[PDB]
Amino acid sequence: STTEEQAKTFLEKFNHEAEDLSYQSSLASWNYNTNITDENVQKMNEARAKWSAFYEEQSRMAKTYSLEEIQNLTLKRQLKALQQSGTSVLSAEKSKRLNTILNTMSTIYSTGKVLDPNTQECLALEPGLDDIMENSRDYNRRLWAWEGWRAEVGKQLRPLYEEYVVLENEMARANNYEDYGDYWRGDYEVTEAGDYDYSRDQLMKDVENTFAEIKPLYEQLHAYVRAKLMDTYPSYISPTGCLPAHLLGDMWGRFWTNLYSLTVPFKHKPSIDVTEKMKNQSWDAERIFKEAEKFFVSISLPHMTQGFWDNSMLTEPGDGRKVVCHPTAWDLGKGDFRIKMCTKVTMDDFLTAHHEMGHIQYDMAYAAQPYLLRDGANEGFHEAVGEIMSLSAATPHYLKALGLLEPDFYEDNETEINFLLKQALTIVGTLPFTYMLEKWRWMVFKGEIPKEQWMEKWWEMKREIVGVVEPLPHDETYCDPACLFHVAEDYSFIRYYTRTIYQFQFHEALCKTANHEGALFKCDISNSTEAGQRLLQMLSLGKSEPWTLALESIVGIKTMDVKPLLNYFEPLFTWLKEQNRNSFVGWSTEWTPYS
Amino acid sequence: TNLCPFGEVFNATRFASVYAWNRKRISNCVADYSVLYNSASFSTFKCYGVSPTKLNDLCFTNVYADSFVIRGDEVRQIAPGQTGKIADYNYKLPDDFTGCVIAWNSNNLDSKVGGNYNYLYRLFRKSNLKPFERDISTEIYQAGSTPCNGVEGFNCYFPLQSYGFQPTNGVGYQPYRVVVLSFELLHAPATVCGP
Numbered sequence: 001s002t003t004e005e006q007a008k009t010f011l012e013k014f015n016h017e018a019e020d021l022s023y024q025s026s027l028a029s030w031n032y033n034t035n036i037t038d039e040n041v042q043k044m045n046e047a048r049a050k051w052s053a054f055y056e057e058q059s060r061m062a063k064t065y066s067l068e069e070i071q072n073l074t075l076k077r078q079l080k081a082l083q084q085s086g087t088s089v090l091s092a093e094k095s096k097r098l099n100t101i102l103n104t105m106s107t108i109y110s111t112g113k114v115l116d117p118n119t120q121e122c123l124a125l126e127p128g129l130d131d132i133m134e135n136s137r138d139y140n141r142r143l144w145a146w147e148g149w150r151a152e153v154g155k156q157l158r159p160l161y162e163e164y165v166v167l168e169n170e171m172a173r174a175n176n177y178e179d180y181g182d183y184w185r186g187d188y189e190v191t192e193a194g195d196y197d198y199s200r201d202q203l204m205k206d207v208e209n210t211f212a213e214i215k216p217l218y219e220q221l222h223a224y225v226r227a228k229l230m231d232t233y234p235s236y237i238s239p240t241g242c243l244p245a246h247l248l249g250d251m252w253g254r255f256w257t258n259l260y261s262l263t264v265p266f267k268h269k270p271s272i273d274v275t276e277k278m279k280n281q282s283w284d285a286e287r288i289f290k291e292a293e294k295f296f297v298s299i300s301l302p303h304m305t306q307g308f309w310d311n312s313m314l315t316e317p318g319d320g321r322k323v324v325c326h327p328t329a330w331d332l333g334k335g336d337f338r339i340k341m342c343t344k345v346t347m348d349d350f351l352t353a354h355h356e357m358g359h360i361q362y363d364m365a366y367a368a369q370p371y372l373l374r375d376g377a378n379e380g381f382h383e384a385v386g387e388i389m390s391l392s393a394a395t396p397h398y399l400k401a402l403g404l405l406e407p408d409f410y411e412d413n414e415t416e417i418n419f420l421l422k423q424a425l426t427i428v429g430t431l432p433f434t435y436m437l438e439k440w441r442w443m444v445f446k447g448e449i450p451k452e453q454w455m456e457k458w459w460e461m462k463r464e465i466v467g468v469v470e471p472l473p474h475d476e477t478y479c480d481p482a483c484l485f486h487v488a489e490d491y492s493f494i495r496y497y498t499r500t501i502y503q504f505q506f507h508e509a510l511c512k513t514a515n516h517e518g519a520l521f522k523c524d525i526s527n528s529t530e531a532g533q534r535l536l537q538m539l540s541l542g543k544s545e546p547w548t549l550a551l552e553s554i555v556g557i558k559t560m561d562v563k564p565l566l567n568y569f570e571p572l573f574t575w576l577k578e579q580n581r582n583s584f585v586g587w588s589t590e591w592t593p594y595s
Numbered sequence: 596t597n598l599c600p601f602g603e604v605f606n607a608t609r610f611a612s613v614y615a616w617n618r619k620r621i622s623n624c625v626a627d628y629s630v631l632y633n634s635a636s637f638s639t640f641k642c643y644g645v646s647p648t649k650l651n652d653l654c655f656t657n658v659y660a661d662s663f664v665i666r667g668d669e670v671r672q673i674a675p676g677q678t679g680k681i682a683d684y685n686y687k688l689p690d691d692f693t694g695c696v697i698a699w700n701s702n703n704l705d706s707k708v709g710g711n712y713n714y715l716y717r718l719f720r721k722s723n724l725k726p727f728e729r730d731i732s733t734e735i736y737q738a739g740s741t742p743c744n745g746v747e748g749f750n751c752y753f754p755l756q757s758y759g760f761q762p763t764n765g766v767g768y769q770p771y772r773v774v775v776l777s778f779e780l781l782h783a784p785a786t787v788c789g790p
């Protein structure tokens with residue numbers, strides 16, 4: 001009869017109705033990714049139109065109830081999540097302009113064309129310009145290619161970005177947030193339980209503090225790559241200067257994975273690989289998925305549903321049907337779980353078979369929860385869970401139990417160091433960059449950096465934090481952040497920083513329960529039922545409890561800590577220190593390339 | 596040896612919904628339960644109040660056959676002294692029960708692509724159902740102090756939802772045909788006893 005009791009009946013109508021429309025929308029989107037045809041595209045637009053219209057009607061109607069009268073905490077969170085709408089609070093004539101920019105920004109990025117000096121062809125970003133940044137060892141060739149992207153996209157994207165910042169700031173103002181940057185950190189906020197509550201401001205002064213311990217690892221890693229690049233490029237890198245931006249390995253330097261060939265520790269020692277022996281015994285596509293199931297069975301996780309093994313895309317079709325080949329893990333809902341991946345007989349597809357299946361086991365765990373709470377605790381939990389499964393499969397101990405390699409292979413620290421440096425380039429390389437990029441965008445929304453000083457402050461942070469420098473001088477007319485997919489679109493980039501930290505927190509905790517003594521290198525979670533039950537109490541939580549409670553449930557702490565990450569790379573830290581003592585470990589921000 | 600057609604209900608072409616469950620009166624017959632036991636379709640067989648074997652050795656005057664279709668996770672709610680969406684609002688079994696419950700998966704026949712919108716149940720109701728009660732009335736539910744004068748809208752919801760069955764749903768959302776048998780004893784010369 002009261003407001004609290006009538007609100008309880010609202011969600012029952014919503015939950016019993018939203019699932020039917022969600023399945024129709026998800027199934028329709030599945031068919032297009034499985035069968036690219038013009039008729040199928042029309043169905044998704046119609047299906048999404050009903051889902052979009054249905055969502056707005058309930059979200060607007062949900063705002064009628066008063067939040068304070070609600071007493072049940074689980075009821076309170078469920079109602080609040082639906083209440084948040086966002087850009088709908090603005091007027092339509094403001095809304096149409098804001099949407100006009102966002103679609104426009106994608107068009108320039110999609111229609112990427114940089115004029116090659118030769119008239120034979122005009123190279124686009126996909127895939128010609130990417131090939132230059134990866135398989136070219138010419139300094140001049142990399143310079144024009146890297147500058148060409150800023151030369152074309154940056155000039156056009158700069159005027160549009162000025163209106164983009166102002167328009168989004170108005171939206172957050174109506175929602176009582178300080179700025180648009182405050183919204184992006186709103187997903188990390190829990191406010192209620194005094195022992196478990198978080199703060200939107202507490203996201204700041206936390207990412208920075210955990211970055212402090214990372215720097216000793218990064219600076220030591222920073223100088224080592226410089227020394228190997230000296231051999232290839234003698235007269236272009238200063239002994240103590242910063243590396244050129246275009247020479248990091250990618251266009252934006254978000255990853256350093258492509259530097260392995262140049263800066264390999266030991267060329268003679270081969271890397272571990274079972275592809276050559278996977279062809280032996282004639283392994284097929286279905287064996288990889290069937291075998292990777294035993295990993296989760298031995299850890300006492302549930303089996304796979306009978307609807308998984310059929311009606312699922314486990315190989316490239318032979319009927320000529322056009323598909324999107326990027327692997328994905330779908331959760332259509334109503335009890336249907338499918339995997340869509342381009343299965344080949346390689347090492348990488350064996351590892352990704354464990355990663356994609358890792359997402360599925362998370363999806364099953366919270367199936368009991370209501371629809372509105374069928375998600376990871378935050379935006380970084382979902383990808384972290386699947387990654388730790390990829391770590392175990394890479395270890396030779398799991399591979400040896402399969403007989404894939406020699407039963408009496410010889411372990412050597414040379415090849416183990418060879419394996420760590422490759423992993424260090426990817427996991428540790430993006431950490432300074434991800435934090436720096438989100439730090440800039442946070443201050444732009446606040447307004448501390450004037451619009452006239454966007455570019456001057458941009459490279460100042462890169463010199464001080466990331467440790468790189470622009471090969472050629474730039475002024476305010478350029479706009480470098482817009483040359484990123486995640487920045488051009490309205491995507492948040494902080495999820496790629498907290499995911500890495502959470503990834504190693506889970507791995508360290510599950511290793512202790514596995515009674516593994518020694519290095520964190522080859523800690524195998526296989527054949528350890530104790531570790532599995534530790535995982536299942538967190539996965540099944542879903543969004544019902546705050547992420548602090550979920551995090552404490554597996555590691556026993558109520559905050560993110562970088563200690564487990566350093567413990568992982570500790571064996572590489574000792575060996576790398578000796579090699580870097582001969583040269584200067586650090587960088588000089590004063591030194592500039594163009595002068 | 597006259598034998599009533601148990602195959603009439605166990606092989607019915609179309610079953611009944613949950614909010615409108617069917618009831619059949621069986622008497623003056625012989626109860627051959629071997630067909631049910633030897634049936635390759637049934638997979639669940641729980642008997643409450645009576646032993647599974649020696650079923651035919653003890654016999655009663657009246658036998659009631661009941662039928663409906665529910666979800667897979669929703670079968671377990673058909674039990675004495677249980678609370679749930681079905682028991683409280685659609686079909687409440689007595690706390691003291693003398694009968695057996697039969698349920699078997701029927702996804703092949705009862706589920707079609709595009710949905711099977713022929714099955715319904717009741718989601719909102721003022722007071723829970725007394726044991727063995729059927730409610731077919733369809734009046735706009737009221738969840739607010741102000742009446743809406745019999746038209747659905749704000750704070751007034753339709754009392755029946757719809758089951759959507761599709762062939763690709765999970766094993767829990769697939770249709771399960773459920774038949775419960777209610778043995779009752781009265782002052783009659785044991786009309787139906789068996790072989």
Ligand SMILES: *[C@@H]1O[C@H](CO)[C@@H](O)[C@H](O)[C@H]1NC(C)=O
Nearest residue numbers: 276277278279280281282283
């Ligand atoms: C597996 O390798 C062995 C060793 O040379 C040889 O029989 C052949 O290359 C492979 N066997 C099969 C059946 O493919």
Ligand SMILES: *[C@@H]1O[C@H](CO)[C@@H](O)[C@H](O)[C@H]1NC(C)=O
Nearest residue numbers: 266411412413414415417575
């Ligand atoms: C570690 O590697 C060095 C050479 O890189 C070698 O001399 C030493 O024996 C190795 N030690 C172990 C324990 O593998």
Ligand SMILES: *[C@@H]1O[C@H](CO)[C@@H](O)[C@H](O)[C@H]1NC(C)=O
Nearest residue numbers: 602603605606607634635636
């Ligand atoms: C009743 O259904 C079963 C299940 O297939 C079948 O074996 C039996 O023949 C049917 N009875 C009749 C009378 O058709």
Ligand SMILES: [Zn+2]
Nearest residue numbers: 382383386387
């Ligand atoms: Zn993942």
